[PDB]
């Protein structure tokens, strides 16, 4: 789908040059309707979004208008004012203009800014023509400016409750610059108030909110407030970085309104353990029940809380979960192929504010002593921060042995000559037998490799230990999108000038580059099938992120999900990673299957929380180590392209087994 | 109405990001369609171009492009800026992931990143435009879309059409007064200035043709009025426009491919500013003039000023020899006789104090000083009031005159030579036309290009003061700001009529300086959406925005009050709408109509909020000193 977008005209002033710059910002035409239209009679639903271009027109019209204002005032749909007269303020926005110093008609204004919706991305000062000589200095107390000239006046506005924004300038002036991305950016608020609007079914749940001002060790709050057995998970910033990471994530199943929840791929049926202990068993595809109880568990986000996830679902997805998005079930995994834990209860650390947050749910009209817990938990907390303030191993097994990986090598390379692939990701998987339990051999490796995305979710079936610093997919609550795609790998130096000379080698070989360069289209490709036309872009390109055991080329990718599109939808489409398949993904998957002759599991797939609010937060699961049986499970892998060596590729995953090797020893 | 573009999905990691370039490239999405569906079923006529990404495909009739069918290889790419890779610079980057045919682009590495169907409107680019990597993406897809436009406009004829060339070239003035019988009705369009890239042509002609016609249009009442060759005349009650528009499809004649320009004869005549009733504006005034007069010219006379040769163009009925290939002969006999050895003076009476003399001895405007001064007053105060931006306000000096049409004409293009001249004798009136301004330049491909003038100076007495004044053009605010507002309204009216993404600006604020003055000009493009006429484009712009201000309506509105009058001829356009579809049109400035014993020429200027009203008046005075001169 797409946004409707009703464009009002005036006289045909400037309405076919507003109309010219939607089409291509958006890549839809808007509707459009004149000023002496009967609001009524039109039907305003539908529409998404209203833009009212300026006169001047006739006197009589301009009159009818503001007879009729309340018809868009009050309407509830996103409105975008440009460069309206003192009547045309007067009536939308209802405030006080005069004349401005410098009061030239077209006059070329450098505009500075906030940088805030209308005006996301654009460059502070940005340059803009002026047609009104009419400008506001006193506002009422209802609008906030969002931009201001050289010449001291308000080029931008908002009102604080309802969605209607003001430019004093003509976006699409050939005098202007930014006109697209301006347009382009009210597409996007209008996306997120559609998003927003919720009607639908009376949420199911309560949500009780405390704030507790300590910040104890998080692994002191697994061992302090969670149990020694039983289901757990621990999302785990085990790095902060101002930007990057932030916080931390704990809970278990004792809550009553908890569920723990699995997936098998060869049945495909949903399995659902309450707090009963009676496990049902419902049939239908994983994210297709997934969707269905995203949508009917909806809670709005708490605005108090400063992260998104407001409790939901925590857990993994399979990578053979392929077979229900672009894939073949050419192989079954020994494991389930997704595991969620539906939490009702979670501790929130805030690295950055030194305070920890509690989550709970009661039902709706129900006391199921979330308060109580709340107020528990913070109790526990506040005590807790006094005692503790904050080549593959000797006994591993390769599933393809050196001289078997060379020549899956050599097949990936014969492939890439016929040009059925662009980039193979070949991985591995390793077995060693350990006496290791799940929370010291992760302690373990959080201290070998601190990374934004550590994970040790603790089931029945098994325990997954994630070293993870690769972002799938972050959503928005509002429907925004971004994931940033690893690929390109350095191992670390010995000395500190040896580590600058693998960082400068990897952001500027050519080899690496390509690599990640066809990950990023691949990723583009997969964000544009479910995000609006024009919204989809690349903020970074080619970074390198350091971490304790290697060195990462790293890609950002940004999007915005169409009108319709759930969060569960998006992460169907873009799973697998691509990052972790290659180009084209379904042929790649095809050869992936027949080669490597074996399930991967949980590695390669994703892991990380599904909330209420809609927002998602998902990693991509690299450096992890599956426990289970006394079994140590960890796969590792490398980017095969037509420049690739053999011994050198089968090195690389020697190279990134580094951490799960050390911890497992 | 729009283009509908179909996008084959081919199974690969690149339909969607292609699908993300040619919406925001054409701001339409393309109907994604996968390549195992069968073409059977496909409705290929609801369809205008076909994108193909990594067999009735190509054999469809549709415009198609190939995207790429050593790897993830960042590669210049050099070309010859023709079709797909119009406008873009060479080098440029591009992404690439892997006859009989014409190769149009070449990597660094020696391999064609570029190739043509010589005959088929079939390309190819073996490169990844949507790539990440890749620059200029969106522009390689909007060409596409481009090329398919053309390629439907490019889709009988009730005439045949003659041609001959004759390698000489004799004074245009000596082939209007030699080849042309001086009484009754013709036309010269006068290349006056010859400057390469400026103006290349002259075209003269008559009515003696035995399928020439003359129209003639009253908005009042609304009657167009047609005259035959027998003599007869045909009266319709409807609007201009589309009339223009009905006989243009009908009498369509393909271009000429061995002539260098794009009349293949056609309509050569004036629209009148009074057919703003029919277009946005309001029939408050009435012209004394016909609010249409064209002449259907079945023979005309080009002059090449570039290559030194004249073409002859005669119309036969596609059955019958109607004497066209015997005028050819006679005409071309006549022309060598009249090739002699070339004969100027530039004419200095421009220098500001004296070119703001006055309108002549015998000469009374409209509005005298004091009358025009209140109204510019008032156009102040509107703009204040915000009911207009920018107004141009003009005046109409009537003096009676003795002179005949073609000396008077004789001396007013030696007095101010232009690329957009005209000798128009008609029944009813004579228009000598010094305009210098392109209103509209409009290809037989649906290509689109209006040069709006707006931003003024009188030649300098020194020449010193002269080029004081030429750099104080280029640079001051006040002008730019004039200028601007029209380039946006103009930008207005053509984006109404042709593709999302096709109206660009190439060029802002250039100075031209001519005999008289010193101009400030801006060049918008654009191209045609299908369904729209050539015809209908000129409607959607006329009348031109350099000549009323902005906001157009509200603004022609205004002027309706303040001059209390028609402009008739002035103001409007003068030039050709061919056969083959492609237009050439001028905005009448400078001019002189001549009719009864007397001569008529607007002059006007812009009024902004900066305006002072002595200078404002002083600009009109300067500007009437060409036809002033002419008369005296
Ligand atoms: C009104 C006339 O000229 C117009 C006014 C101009 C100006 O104000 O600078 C320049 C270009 C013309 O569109 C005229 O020449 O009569
Ligand atoms: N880094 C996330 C929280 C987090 C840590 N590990 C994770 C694993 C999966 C998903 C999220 C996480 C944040 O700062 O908000
Ligand atoms: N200058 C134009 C022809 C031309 C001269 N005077 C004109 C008046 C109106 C329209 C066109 C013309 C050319 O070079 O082709
Ligand atoms: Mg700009
Ligand atoms: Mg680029
Ligand atoms: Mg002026």
Redesign the interface.
Same mark, same amino acid.
């Given at each position: 789908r797409h946004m409707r977008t009703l464009l009002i005209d005036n /006289? =045909? %002033?400037?309405?076919?040059?507003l109309?010219?710059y939607i089409?291509?910002?958006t890549?839809?035409?808007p509707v459009v309707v004149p000023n002496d239209a009967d609001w009524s009679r039109l039907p305003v639903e539908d529409f998404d979004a209203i833009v009212v271009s300026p006169?001047?027109?006739?006197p009589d019209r301009e009159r009818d208008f503001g007879i009729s204002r309340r018809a868009i005032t009050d309407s509830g749909l996103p409105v975008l004012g440009v460069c309206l007269?003192?009547q045309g303020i007067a009536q939308l926005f209802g405030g006080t203009v005069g004349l401005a110093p410098e009061?030239?008609?077209?006059? &070329?204004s450098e505009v500075r800014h906030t940088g805030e919706d209308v005006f996301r991305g654009l460059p502070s000062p940005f340059t803009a &023509?002026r /047609?009104?000589?009419?400008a506001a200095t006193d506002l009422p107390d209802e609008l906030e400016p969002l931009a201001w000239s050289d010449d001291g006046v308000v080029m931008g506005l908002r009102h604080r409750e309802k969605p209607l924004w003001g430019v004093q300038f003509?976006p699409? %002036?050939?005098?202007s610059d930014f006109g697209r991305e301006i347009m382009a950016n009210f597409r996007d608020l209008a996306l997120a108030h559609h998003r927003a609007r919720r009607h639908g079914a009376d949420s199911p749940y309560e949500l009780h909110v405390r704030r507790v001002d300590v910040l104890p060790d998080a692994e002191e709050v697994r061992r302090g407030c969670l149990p020694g057995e039983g289901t757990t998970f621990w999302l785990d910033s085990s790095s902060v970085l101002e930007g990057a990471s932030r916080f931390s994530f704990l809970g278990d199943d004792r809550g009553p309104l908890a569920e723990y929840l699995t997936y098998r791929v060869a049945d495909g049926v949903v399995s659902v353990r309450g707090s009963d202990g009676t496990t049902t068993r419902t049939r239908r595809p994983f994210f297709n029940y997934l969707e269905e109880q995203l949508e009917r568990r909806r809670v709005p986000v708490a605005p108090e809380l400063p992260f998104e996830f407001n409790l939901g679902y925590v857990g993994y997805l399979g990578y053979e979960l392929k077979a229900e998005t672009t894939g073949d079930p050419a192989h079954r995994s020994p494991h389930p192929d997704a595991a969620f834990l539906f939490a009702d209860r979670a501790i929130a650390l805030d690295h950055q504010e030194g305070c920890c947050y509690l989550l709970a749910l009661d039902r709706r009209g129900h006391d199921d002593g979330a308060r109580a817990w709340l107020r528990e938990t913070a109790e526990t907390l506040t005590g807790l921060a006094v005692r503790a303030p904050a080549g593959f191993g000797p006994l591993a097994r390769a599933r393809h042995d050196k001289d078997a990986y060379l020549k899956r090598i050599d097949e990936c390379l014969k492939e890439?000559r016929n @040009?059925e692939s /662009?980039?193979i990701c070949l991985t591995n998987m390793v077995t060693a037998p350990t006496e290791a339990t799940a929370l010291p051999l992760y302690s373990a490796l959080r201290a070998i490799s601190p990374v934004p995305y550590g994970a040790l979710l603790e089931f029945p079936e098994l325990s997954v230990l994630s070293a993870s610093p690769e972002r799938f997919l972050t959503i928005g609550a509002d429907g925004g999108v971004e994931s940033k795609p690893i690929k390109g790998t350095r191992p670390r130096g010995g000395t500190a000038e040896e580590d600058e000379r693998l960082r400068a080698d990897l952001a500027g070989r050519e080899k690496d580059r390509?690599?990640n360069?066809?990950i990023? =289209?691949?990723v583009?490709?997969?964000l544009?099938?479910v995000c609006a036309?024009?919204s989809?872009h690349?903020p970074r390109?080619f970074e390198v992120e350091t971490y304790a055991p290697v060195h990462q080329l790293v890609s950002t990718i940004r999007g915005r999900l169409r009108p319709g599109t759930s969060t569960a939808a998006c992460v169907r489409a873009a799973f697998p990673g @691509?990052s972790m398949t290659g180009?084209? $993904? $379904?042929?790649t998957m095809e050869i992936i299957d027949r080669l490597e002759e074996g399930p991967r599991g949980v590695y390669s797939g994703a892991l990380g929380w599904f909330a209420l609010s809609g927002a998602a937060d998902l990693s991509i699961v690299i450096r992890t180590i599956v426990l289970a049986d006394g079994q140590a499970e960890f796969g590792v892998g490398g980017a095969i &392209? %037509?420049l690739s060596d053999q011994e050198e590729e089968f090195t690389e995953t020697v190279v990134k087994a580094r951490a799960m090797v050390t911890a497992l020893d």
């Open positions: /006289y =045909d %002033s400037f309405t076919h040059n109309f010219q089409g291509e910002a890549g839809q035409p006169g001047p027109g006739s007269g003192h009061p030239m008609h077209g006059r &070329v &023509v /047609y009104h000589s009419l003509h699409e %002036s050939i005098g890439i @040009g /662009y980039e390509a690599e360069l066809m990023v =289209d691949l583009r490709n997969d544009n099938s036309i024009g989809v690349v390109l @691509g180009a084209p $993904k $379904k042929r &392209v %037509s």
